[PDB]
Amino acid sequence: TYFAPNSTGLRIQHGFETILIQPFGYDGFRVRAWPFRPPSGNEISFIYDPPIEGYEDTAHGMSYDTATTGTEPRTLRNGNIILRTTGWGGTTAGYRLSFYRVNDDGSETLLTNEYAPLKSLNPRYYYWPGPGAEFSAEFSFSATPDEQIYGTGTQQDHMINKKGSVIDMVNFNSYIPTPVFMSNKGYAFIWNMPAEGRMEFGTLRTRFTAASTTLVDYVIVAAQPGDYDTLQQRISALTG
Amino acid sequence: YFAPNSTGLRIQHGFETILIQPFGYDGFRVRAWPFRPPSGNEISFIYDPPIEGYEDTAHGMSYDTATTGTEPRTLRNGNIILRTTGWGGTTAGYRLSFYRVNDDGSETLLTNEYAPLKSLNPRYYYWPGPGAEFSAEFSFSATPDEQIYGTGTQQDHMINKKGSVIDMVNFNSYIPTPVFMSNKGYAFIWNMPAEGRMEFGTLRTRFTAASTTLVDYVIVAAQPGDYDTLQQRISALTGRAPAPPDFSLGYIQSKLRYENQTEVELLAQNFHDRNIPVSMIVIDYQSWAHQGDWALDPRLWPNVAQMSARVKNLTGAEMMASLWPSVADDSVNYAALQANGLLSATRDGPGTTDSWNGSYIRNYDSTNPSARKFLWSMLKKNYYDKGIKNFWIDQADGGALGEAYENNGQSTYIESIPFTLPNVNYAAGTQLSVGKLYPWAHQQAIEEGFRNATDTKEGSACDHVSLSRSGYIGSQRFCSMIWSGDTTSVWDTLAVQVASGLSAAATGWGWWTVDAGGFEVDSTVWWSGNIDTPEYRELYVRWLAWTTFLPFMRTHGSRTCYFQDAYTCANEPWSYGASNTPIIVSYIHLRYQLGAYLKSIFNQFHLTGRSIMRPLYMDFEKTDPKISQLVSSNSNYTTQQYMFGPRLLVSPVTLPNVTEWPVYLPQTGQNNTKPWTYWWTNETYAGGQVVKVPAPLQHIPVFHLGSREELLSGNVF
Amino acid sequence: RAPAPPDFSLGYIQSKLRYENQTEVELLAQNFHDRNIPVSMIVIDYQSWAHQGDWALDPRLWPNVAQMSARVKNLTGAEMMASLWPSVADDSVNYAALQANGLLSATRDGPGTTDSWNGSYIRNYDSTNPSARKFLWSMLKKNYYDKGIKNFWIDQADGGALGEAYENNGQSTYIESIPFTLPNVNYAAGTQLSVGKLYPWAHQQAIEEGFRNATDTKEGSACDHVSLSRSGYIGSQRF
Numbered sequence A: 001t002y003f004a005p006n007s008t009g010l011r012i013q014h015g016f017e018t019i020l021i022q023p024f025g026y027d028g029f030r031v032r033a034w035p036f037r038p039p040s041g042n043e044i045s046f047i048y049d050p051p052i053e054g055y056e057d058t059a060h061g062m063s064y065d066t067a068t069t070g071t072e073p074r075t076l077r078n079g080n081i082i083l084r085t086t087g088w089g090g091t092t093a094g095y096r097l098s099f100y101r102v103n104d105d106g107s108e109t110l111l112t113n114e115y116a117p118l119k120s121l122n123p124r125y126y127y128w129p130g131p132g133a134e135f136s137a138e139f140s141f142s143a144t145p146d147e148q149i150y151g152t153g154t155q156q157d158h159m160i161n162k163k164g165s166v167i168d169m170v171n172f173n174s175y176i177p178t179p180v181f182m183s184n185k186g187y188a189f190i191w192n193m194p195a196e197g198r199m200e201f202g203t204l205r206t207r208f209t210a211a212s213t214t215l216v217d218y219v220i221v222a223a224q225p226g227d228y229d230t231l232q233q234r235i236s237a238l239t240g
Numbered sequence B: 001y002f003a004p005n006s007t008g009l010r011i012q013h014g015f016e017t018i019l020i021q022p023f024g025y026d027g028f029r030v031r032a033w034p035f036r037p038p039s040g041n042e043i044s045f046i047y048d049p050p051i052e053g054y055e056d057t058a059h060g061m062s063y064d065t066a067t068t069g070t071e072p073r074t075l076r077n078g079n080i081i082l083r084t085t086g087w088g089g090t091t092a093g094y095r096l097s098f099y100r101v102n103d104d105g106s107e108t109l110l111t112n113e114y115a116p117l118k119s120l121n122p123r124y125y126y127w128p129g130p131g132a133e134f135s136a137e138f139s140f141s142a143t144p145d146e147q148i149y150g151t152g153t154q155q156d157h158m159i160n161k162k163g164s165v166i167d168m169v170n171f172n173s174y175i176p177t178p179v180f181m182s183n184k185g186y187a188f189i190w191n192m193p194a195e196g197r198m199e200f201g202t203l204r205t206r207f208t209a210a211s212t213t214l215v216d217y218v219i220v221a222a223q224p225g226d227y228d229t230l231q232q233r234i235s236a237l238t239g240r241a242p243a244p245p246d247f248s249l250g251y252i253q254s255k256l257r258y259e260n261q262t263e264v265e266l267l268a269q270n271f272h273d274r275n276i277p278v279s280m281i282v283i284d285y286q287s288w289a290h291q292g293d294w295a296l297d298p299r300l301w302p303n304v305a306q307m308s309a310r311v312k313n314l315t316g317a318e319m320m321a322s323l324w325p326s327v328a329d330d331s332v333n334y335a336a337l338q339a340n341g342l343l344s345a346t347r348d349g350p351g352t353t354d355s356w357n358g359s360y361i362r363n364y365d366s367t368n369p370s371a372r373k374f375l376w377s378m379l380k381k382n383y384y385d386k387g388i389k390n391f392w393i394d395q396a397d398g399g400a401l402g403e404a405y406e407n408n409g410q411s412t413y414i415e416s417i418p419f420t421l422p423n424v425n426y427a428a429g430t431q432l433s434v435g436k437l438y439p440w441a442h443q444q445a446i447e448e449g450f451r452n453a454t455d456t457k458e459g460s461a462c463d464h465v466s467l468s469r470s471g472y473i474g475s476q477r478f479c480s481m482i483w484s485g486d487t488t489s490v491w492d493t494l495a496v497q498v499a500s501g502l503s504a505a506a507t508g509w510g511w512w513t514v515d516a517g518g519f520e521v522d523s524t525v526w527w528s529g530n531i532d533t534p535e536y537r538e539l540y541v542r543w544l545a546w547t548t549f550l551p552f553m554r555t556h557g558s559r560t561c562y563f564q565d566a567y568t569c570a571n572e573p574w575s576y577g578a579s580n581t582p583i584i585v586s587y588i589h590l591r592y593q594l595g596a597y598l599k600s601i602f603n604q605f606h607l608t609g610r611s612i613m614r615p616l617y618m619d620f621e622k623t624d625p626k627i628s629q630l631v632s633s634n635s636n637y638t639t640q641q642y643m644f645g646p647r648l649l650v651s652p653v654t655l656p657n658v659t660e661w662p663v664y665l666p667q668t669g670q671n672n673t674k675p676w677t678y679w680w681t682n683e684t685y686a687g688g689q690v691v692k693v694p695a696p697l698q699h700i701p702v703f704h705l706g707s708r709e710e711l712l713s714g715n716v717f
Numbered sequence C: 001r002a003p004a005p006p007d008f009s010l011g012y013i014q015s016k017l018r019y020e021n022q023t024e025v026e027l028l029a030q031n032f033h034d035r036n037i038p039v040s041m042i043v044i045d046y047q048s049w050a051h052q053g054d055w056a057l058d059p060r061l062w063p064n065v066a067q068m069s070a071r072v073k074n075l076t077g078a079e080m081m082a083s084l085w086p087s088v089a090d091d092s093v094n095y096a097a098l099q100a101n102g103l104l105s106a107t108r109d110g111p112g113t114t115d116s117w118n119g120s121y122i123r124n125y126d127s128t129n130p131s132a133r134k135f136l137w138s139m140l141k142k143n144y145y146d147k148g149i150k151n152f153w154i155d156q157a158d159g160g161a162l163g164e165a166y167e168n169n170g171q172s173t174y175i176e177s178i179p180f181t182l183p184n185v186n187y188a189a190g191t192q193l194s195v196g197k198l199y200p201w202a203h204q205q206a207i208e209e210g211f212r213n214a215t216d217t218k219e220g221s222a223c224d225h226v227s228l229s230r231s232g233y234i235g236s237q238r239f
């Protein structure tokens, strides 16, 4: 009785950047974005395709069902997670991402969306520091002051709630920063990137950065609140 | 005063040099650089010597002791002491730590360099280019209970910035400025013009610079709860504000936009015939022929000296005009600006920095002194010498043309395409290395022109003012007021503006204001900005009432309407319904009735940096024990209430259809009395409780300490 | 290995800057016919469009171009060639579509403009983007090829800036002489520094693909039509 998806993925052409959102595993979406040049195909990934456990029969790859330029809003549902493409500001469009969970009582809860209030930097920011095509990436997502962040690897901070902390993604003795975290809102998030960077768990914005990359890749999975054993069931099905 | 026994300490720690000097009262200045010494032409926003301090002359690079940091040392100036230490269990002197000597003799650690056993270097250097310029990341320790106030302006609805990351990139309504106070009893200034990052994490505070040749910061200590001294030290370091001209304290009429000369003359005729006082009429943008002409289009403003004189004859009001920093090819000044190198430019390609009005443009170089003087020669010829002697320096955030997206003026879809923000070339550096200076130097362009025409020195009494949307460290030194930028005309926006102005106060900015009623229409709220609907008419009257108790009372916005009889929808005190006209005019009269109180509190800000609009921790943290937590949680009682001067307590109504409003009256320190008097009922209440007062549409919840006749006299200090 | 050229291209090619409207072109063919002077191809130069990026003759001066090409072939038997620039301006009817589908190159920071011309700052279309090559042929085949103008003059497609070794083209020689750095723009195949030499080669390829698609012919076989290019690279003789 699983709410299987009706689309293999959505590919948005937003100017020079392409965003490929695909249903991935149970109650999960996989988002990939790149400016100008398509993925080489030799990028390093830490997630399984298809997931170790999920609704799928075969791997997704780059497959998608619908292509748009993001002029109009769209909606895609997989399991209990729903994606809603929207505009920025008062506009009605479909180049901004937002993720909801369908609760047991029929209502919906906003897990997170791309941090794009009226006056703010682009939630998918690209910057070219070198003469080549490799770029640095800064992706921003909304957050609430009451949110709680669990995981993010190991660190001697004497805290299990990582909210309000910045975690640099550079390894050294006793410090293994890993961008895999659970939120008490009922969702988990995987920044599937091997590049060094930064984890910002701010009061109103969650931001991940990549020092140098050719492709941004993350996965978001939803679960009913308080049910952390399912979140870990989904994370392990994605990463091992 | 505990004067220091050393002029400074210079540490040679490998290839990096650290120069720590006593600076002002209870302050230390720290400068560090790897390999190459400072050129001496770095951009600095602090005074040497401070405007007020123990010193007789400037410090410069002078120091008393030189060491390699092999052994620990101690240096004391005032109540702050520096202790150089090792890292880990080591005994050395290459790590910095700062303590305050309390009144009871004991000491409290303000902060040290974040260096636990396993951690990155608290002074991290990185070379991204082939040259010697470097990126810097400086880390300081922090505690989970700490509270951060200031950091500039932002629409975050918080006065406690703990747990937030603040990017140092300017855009509309967002002026990140690395000057903050901590509730531990110290202030900190990251004296750097480079773009970067502010990390106020749970256990680590980090500042970064994208490209620089020198790191420079100042730390100053004060006894806990005593924020008035922190602001006294900050203003002595970065600038003591001048006294504003008396006319600027009145009612400022503005909108988007008064389009031709005869429309402005009928506006003054309306204020005169209706016997409604007005102190300044503002002319908005798009009033020029081309971007960069810096003059009113004669086809719509044929005789502006006659216009300003007629406006002054009917209302006595002064005039203000708008200018943008962008110049297009169709400008009469484009060839001259291009030839003399007075324009910024992207570092490859044609050099255009953004777009507007269907043309791609280039911002003038405010860091170039020749460009600043070229621009005043236009403003003085076409405005100042023609009766318009106040200037609206709009859309000068720096880099792009005022927004966080490129291709301004085009479709919102194109604006949303993530074109990278430009790292432009300036005369003083690049956008990444010196970008934060651009709006600060733009204010300076008008300040230099003002002081030159009046033959007065900076810091003295102003004859005229400028209206700016951005700034930086020490922007309070100019005859210039900052406003919160483009806001939406909805109820939630009105509640968020308060915390932005309170954060500006903690940054050192006193001359702050908003757009009464908001600026932009919210397309998802059908009544937003509609001056003919009762829904927005209610919102505007609540908003206009609040601006009465702000450093500057000004109305402005881009309204919508059902009936239009001009170029744009109206925004005048008689444009919101017949029943609302007497309400708006009453607050206009009340504003002029507070003139003595306004000039008195603006003067103390000029002498001491005495904050004008005051967050509740500055006056009642020592007193009310409940306030420490109400600020930590960013309660509406602390993000939406404030002290306007030493006597008034203000709390705007931020909800529709409301007749009672809950105001938290803080404790004042006399438990057997009732010090709070409600303005509209004259009823007295005791401190330390939340009260629900009658708040009809015409009344804004305002309490006052002492007698009303004394605060109206100005004698409050 | 180069293809064999069409026989008509080996004759006399008449061109200048510039034949401005349709009636001037028709009187030119009438002159060759009345004087019995042979001509094999008539060329229409640039600035014959309404906006940069429209990729069509301005109807205010070329009202019926299918009739113009047919009249030219009736009087002289000559084929026709028209000019197109790779620049796109905001006033273009194709600007919104080119921007939304990512068919324009761009400088890597700032608004993205790559040069200037005709008093407007412009962006070059991305010849390395296969989708952009298709977009441009859909314009040329609609407004030229299917209307008797089946040879194309792909001018000012050197890559990076707009055809010159200086930025701010079309402006004063003093401004042009100011050493604004040549742009390291973003392409779909790389940057100007990493793949820039491909731009004019891929621009020739755009029309070669269009020519071979219309005639159902393989590249390298006999050509029915030609293109006039000012730049190229390794192996450009294959077109």
Ligand SMILES: *[C@@H]1O[C@H](CO)[C@@H](O[C@@H]2O[C@H](CO)[C@@H](O[C@@H]3O[C@H](CO[C@H]4O[C@H](CO[C@H]5O[C@H](CO)[C@@H](O)[C@H](O)[C@@H]5O[C@H]5O[C@H](CO)[C@@H](O)[C@H](O)[C@@H]5O)[C@@H](O)[C@H](O[C@H]5O[C@H](CO)[C@@H](O)[C@H](O)[C@@H]5O)[C@@H]4O)[C@@H](O)[C@H](O[C@H]4O[C@H](CO)[C@@H](O)[C@H](O)[C@@H]4O[C@H]4O[C@H](CO)[C@@H](O)[C@H](O)[C@@H]4O[C@H]4O[C@H](CO)[C@@H](O)[C@H](O)[C@@H]4O)[C@@H]3O)[C@H](O)[C@H]2NC(C)=O)[C@H](O)[C@H]1NC(C)=O
Residues within 6 Å of the ligand: A084, A089, A100, A108, A109, A110, A113, A114, A115, A116, A117, A118, A142, A145, B157, B490, B491, B492, B493, B495, B522, B524, B525, B526, B634, B635, B636, B640, B654, B655
């Ligand atoms: C004291 O201090 C406190 C702070 O410390 C302060 O609290 C702050 O208060 C304000 C106002 O009270 C709060 O602001 C609101 O926040 C809401 C939540 O925002 C987030 O989530 C939404 C998505 O929300 C959808 O789904 C959830 C869950 O399912 C629902 O609960 C929601 O209702 C909403 O549902 C709709 O849309 C769904 C999807 O399409 C549908 O499925 C569903 O059916 C519904 O139709 C995100 O969109 C937000 O993202 C935005 O902001 C983030 C981060 O900034 C950005 O990253 C992102 O890009 C976006 O910009 C966000 O994540 C908002 O929903 C709410 O929005 C309303 O008002 C604002 C104006 O302020 C409008 O601009 C906005 O359009 C919304 O207006 C509509 O609804 C209002 C009233 O509800 C109507 O009046 C209005 O007409 C309009 O109607 C629209 O929808 C109607 C629905 O039927 C429809 O009828 C109409 O036709 C019309 O279309 C607002 O922003 C803020 O969060 C508080 N902050 C905190 C920390 O608590 C407090 O106020 C202070 N108190 C006092 C007295 O001062």
Ligand SMILES: *[C@@H]1O[C@H](CO)[C@@H](O[C@@H]2O[C@H](CO)[C@@H](O[C@@H]3O[C@H](CO[C@H]4O[C@H](CO[C@H]5O[C@H](CO)[C@@H](O)[C@H](O)[C@@H]5O[C@H]5O[C@H](CO)[C@@H](O)[C@H](O)[C@@H]5O)[C@@H](O)[C@H](O[C@H]5O[C@H](CO)[C@@H](O)[C@H](O)[C@@H]5O)[C@@H]4O)[C@@H](O)[C@H](O[C@H]4O[C@H](CO)[C@@H](O)[C@H](O)[C@@H]4O[C@H]4O[C@H](CO)[C@@H](O)[C@H](O)[C@@H]4O[C@H]4O[C@H](CO)[C@@H](O)[C@H](O)[C@@H]4O)[C@@H]3O)[C@H](O)[C@H]2NC(C)=O)[C@H](O)[C@H]1NC(C)=O
Residues within 6 Å of the ligand: A158, B083, B088, B107, B108, B109, B112, B113, B114, B115, B116, B117, B140, B141, B144
């Ligand atoms: C439940 O959870 C709770 C939280 O989740 C948890 O709380 C945590 O508990 C731990 C353990 O208690 C706390 O850790 C301590 O933190 C202290 C404060 O550290 C900060 O400040 C110091 C500098 O402070 C000085 O000045 C202040 C005020 O003036 C004094 O109060 C201090 O005592 C101290 O004074 C000395 O030095 C002064 C000047 O030099 C002198 O004037 C004075 O006379 C004193 O000699 C900073 O140095 C610290 O910085 C370090 O960490 C930051 C950030 O990580 C880095 O940036 C920086 O580089 C440094 O690494 C910090 O900012 C520490 O002082 C305290 O340290 C002692 O123990 C640790 C081992 O844990 C030793 O490694 C360390 O050397 C210290 O040891 C000395 O003193 C101890 C006992 O006090 C002796 O046992 C020991 O022998 C040693 O002796 C030395 O000094 C003696 C002084 O008399 C002397 O007699 C000896 O001869 C010898 O010289 C420790 O790290 C932690 O903060 C809590 N965390 C939080 C969030 O609260 C709680 O435990 C949990 N509960 C349970 C049941 O689990």
Ligand SMILES: *[C@@H]1O[C@H](CO)[C@@H](O[C@@H]2O[C@H](CO)[C@@H](O[C@@H]3O[C@H](CO[C@H]4O[C@H](CO[C@H]5O[C@H](CO)[C@@H](O)[C@H](O)[C@@H]5O)[C@@H](O)[C@H](O[C@H]5O[C@H](CO)[C@@H](O)[C@H](O)[C@@H]5O)[C@@H]4O)[C@@H](O)[C@H](O[C@H]4O[C@H](CO)[C@@H](O)[C@H](O)[C@@H]4O[C@H]4O[C@H](CO)[C@@H](O)[C@H](O)[C@@H]4O[C@H]4O[C@H](CO)[C@@H](O)[C@H](O)[C@@H]4O)[C@@H]3O)[C@H](O)[C@H]2NC(C)=O)[C@H](O)[C@H]1NC(C)=O
Residues within 6 Å of the ligand: C020, C021, C022, C023, C047, C048, C049, C050, C051, C058, C060, C061, C062, C063, C118, C119
């Ligand atoms: C950037 O680039 C862009 C383009 O990429 C540049 O834009 C271009 O600039 C060029 C020149 O710089 C322009 O060429 C001129 O165009 C005008 C306009 O022509 C049009 O509009 C005419 C009238 O329109 C009005 O009425 C119509 C009625 O329907 C109405 O719809 C409309 O709203 C408006 O109110 C039309 O009549 C005319 O059409 C005619 O001719 C067509 C050609 O074949 C034909 O198709 C039509 O059937 C119709 O017959 C057309 O649509 C032209 O007028 C102008 O031509 C004059 O000047 C040129 C020299 O530049 C000269 O060679 C011509 O002979 C002509 O000269 C007459 O008047 C002169 C007075 O100035 C006079 O001196 C001449 O002698 C001549 O007149 C008389 O005697 C002679 C012989 O004795 C006789 O032949 C005449 O009939 C007459 O009796 C140019 O072609 C482009 O149009 C323009 N393109 C665009 C899109 O704007 C831009 O400048 C650049 N920008 C920058 C910053 O660099």
Ligand SMILES: *[C@@H]1O[C@H](CO)[C@@H](O[C@@H]2O[C@H](CO)[C@@H](O[C@@H]3O[C@H](CO[C@H]4O[C@H](CO[C@H]5O[C@H](CO)[C@@H](O)[C@H](O)[C@@H]5O)[C@@H](O)[C@H](O[C@H]5O[C@H](CO)[C@@H](O)[C@H](O)[C@@H]5O)[C@@H]4O)[C@@H](O)[C@H](O[C@H]4O[C@H](CO)[C@@H](O)[C@H](O)[C@@H]4O[C@H]4O[C@H](CO)[C@@H](O)[C@H](O)[C@@H]4O)[C@@H]3O)[C@H](O)[C@H]2NC(C)=O)[C@H](O)[C@H]1NC(C)=O
Residues within 6 Å of the ligand: B259, B260, B261, B262, B286, B287, B288, B289, B290, B297, B298, B299, B300, B301, B302, B357, B358, B566, B567
């Ligand atoms: C980018 O930005 C630029 C600017 O930064 C934008 O440009 C501007 O756009 C605005 C509006 O979009 C324009 O304002 C409009 O200007 C016109 C033109 O006005 C001038 O010329 C008039 C006619 O001139 C002729 O005769 C003279 C002889 O001297 C010749 O030289 C000319 O060549 C012409 O042949 C002239 O009559 C006007 O003068 C009058 O008013 C002035 C000022 O009060 C007096 O000094 C004069 O004495 C004289 O009375 C003027 O010089 C105006 O006509 C427009 O007004 C109308 O429309 C308004 C709303 O748009 C409305 O509020 C007005 O009431 C008025 O309405 C008219 O129509 C109504 C109903 O249809 C009638 O009821 C009413 O009677 C009247 O008929 C308006 O003010 C700017 O001019 C223009 N600026 C520039 C430099 O071009 C540009 O649009 C932007 N572009 C992009 C892509 O974003």
Ligand SMILES: OC[C@H]1O[C@@H](O[C@H]2[C@@H](OC[C@H]3O[C@@H](O[C@H]4[C@H](O)[C@@H](O)[C@H](O)O[C@@H]4CO)[C@H](O)[C@@H](O)[C@@H]3O[C@@H]3O[C@H](CO)[C@@H](O)[C@H](O)[C@H]3O)OC[C@@H](O)[C@@H]2O)[C@H](O)[C@@H](O)[C@H]1O
Residues within 6 Å of the ligand: A089, A090, A091, B256, B401, B402, B403, B408, B409, B410, B411, B412, B520, B521, B523, B558, B559, B560
């Ligand atoms: O940007 C070009 C693009 O704008 C489209 O507007 C969208 C945009 O609106 C912002 C704009 O609002 C004006 O006011 C309008 C309001 O938009 C209408 O809803 C209302 O009915 O009428 C009022 C008055 O005409 C303000 O006057 C503008 O200042 C404001 O634009 C900002 O302007 C500043 C500089 O002044 C600039 O820096 C900013 O970049 C710019 O946003 O955003 C909100 C969307 O809902 C609007 O659709 C427009 O529709 C379109 O045609 C095109 O012109």
Ligand SMILES: OC[C@H]1O[C@@H](O[C@H]2[C@@H](OC[C@H]3O[C@@H](O[C@H]4[C@H](O)[C@@H](O)[C@H](O)O[C@@H]4CO)[C@H](O)[C@@H](O)[C@@H]3O[C@@H]3O[C@H](CO)[C@@H](O)[C@H](O)[C@H]3O)OC[C@@H](O)[C@@H]2O)[C@H](O)[C@@H](O)[C@H]1O
Residues within 6 Å of the ligand: C017, C162, C163, C164, C169, C170, C171, C172, C173
């Ligand atoms: O470049 C703009 C700038 O030109 C100034 O002209 C200078 C320039 O001339 C080059 C230009 O020549 C045209 O032919 C002119 C000729 O130059 C004149 O001497 C003659 O009297 O008139 C003819 C035609 O009217 C060509 O038609 C143009 O192609 C050529 O311009 C170059 O154009 C190509 C594209 O066509 C472009 O890619 C180049 O960037 C551009 O340079 O250089 C020689 C100087 O002696 C001239 O003074 C002009 O004065 C000025 O107003 C401005 O328009």
Ligand SMILES: *[C@@H]1O[C@H](CO)[C@@H](O)[C@H](O)[C@H]1NC(C)=O
Residues within 6 Å of the ligand: B005, B006, B074, B075, B076
């Ligand atoms: C200066 O004073 C500090 C403490 O105030 C002391 O540790 C140091 O030895 C003194 N140095 C000199 C030269 O007096």
Ligand SMILES: *[C@@H]1O[C@H](CO)[C@@H](O)[C@H](O)[C@H]1NC(C)=O
Residues within 6 Å of the ligand: B309, B310, B313, B314
């Ligand atoms: C002041 O206004 C009155 C209005 O009648 C006018 O008579 C008088 O000349 C004006 N003075 C000036 C300097 O314009």
Ligand SMILES: *[C@@H]1O[C@H](CO)[C@@H](O)[C@H](O)[C@H]1NC(C)=O
Residues within 6 Å of the ligand: B452, B453, B455
């Ligand atoms: C102000 O600048 C002017 C230049 O127009 C100069 O002549 C004058 O001396 C300056 N005023 C001073 C130095 O007081």
Ligand SMILES: *[C@@H]1O[C@H](CO)[C@@H](O)[C@H](O)[C@H]1NC(C)=O
Residues within 6 Å of the ligand: B259, B260, B261, B262, B263, B565, B566, B567
């Ligand atoms: C000037 O403004 C008045 C008042 O709004 C208006 O009636 C008139 O049409 C305007 N004139 C022009 C040319 O815009």
Ligand SMILES: *[C@@H]1O[C@H](CO)[C@@H](O)[C@H](O)[C@H]1NC(C)=O
Residues within 6 Å of the ligand: B679, B680, B681, B682, B708, B709
């Ligand atoms: C409140 O007192 C003031 C003077 O202190 C007076 O002007 C006002 O009318 C009083 N309002 C009342 C009694 O409602």
Ligand SMILES: *[C@@H]1O[C@H](CO)[C@@H](O)[C@H](O)[C@H]1NC(C)=O
Residues within 6 Å of the ligand: C074, C075
């Ligand atoms: C071309 O058509 C014309 C009629 O418009 C006719 O007189 C002439 O014979 C034709 N010539 C050729 C070569 O078809």
Ligand SMILES: *[C@@H]1O[C@H](CO)[C@@H](O)[C@H](O)[C@H]1NC(C)=O
Residues within 6 Å of the ligand: C213, C214, C215, C216, C217
């Ligand atoms: C050429 O491309 C078109 C689409 O543009 C396609 O329909 C056709 O099959 C291709 N081949 C030929 C010979 O037309």
